[PDB]
């Protein structure tokens, strides 16, 4: 595929990604959901207490094969109207 935003070079790479932000408990449920629509096999997002009980790190593994793919799965996660962000 070539579309120059979710498809082009056509090879899953390993992203390794941490989506930091609030703690959602619907966040894991979208990492893995938006990460197997886009890429083949299923992930998830190794939260850990960085600040506080309402704010969470996690850390997303995605094999997206192109490198703007990841970006918008992040979007698909960390759509929330808090605080989302990735690394």
């Known amino acids: 595929m070539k579309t120059k935003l979710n498809e082009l070079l056509e090879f899953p790479t390993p992203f390794t990604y941490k989506v930091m932000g609030q703690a959602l408990p619907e966040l894991v449920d979208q990492v893995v959901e938006v990460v197997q629509r886009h890429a083949p096999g299923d992930y998830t997002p190794t939260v850990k207490p960085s600040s506080k009980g309402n704010y969470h790190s996690v850390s997303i593994t995605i094999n997206a094969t192109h490198i703007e ?12 109207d808090i605080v989302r962000m990735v690394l």
Do not use: F, N, S
């Open 69 to 80: 793919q990841v970006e918008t799965l992040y979007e698909e996660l960390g759509k929330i």
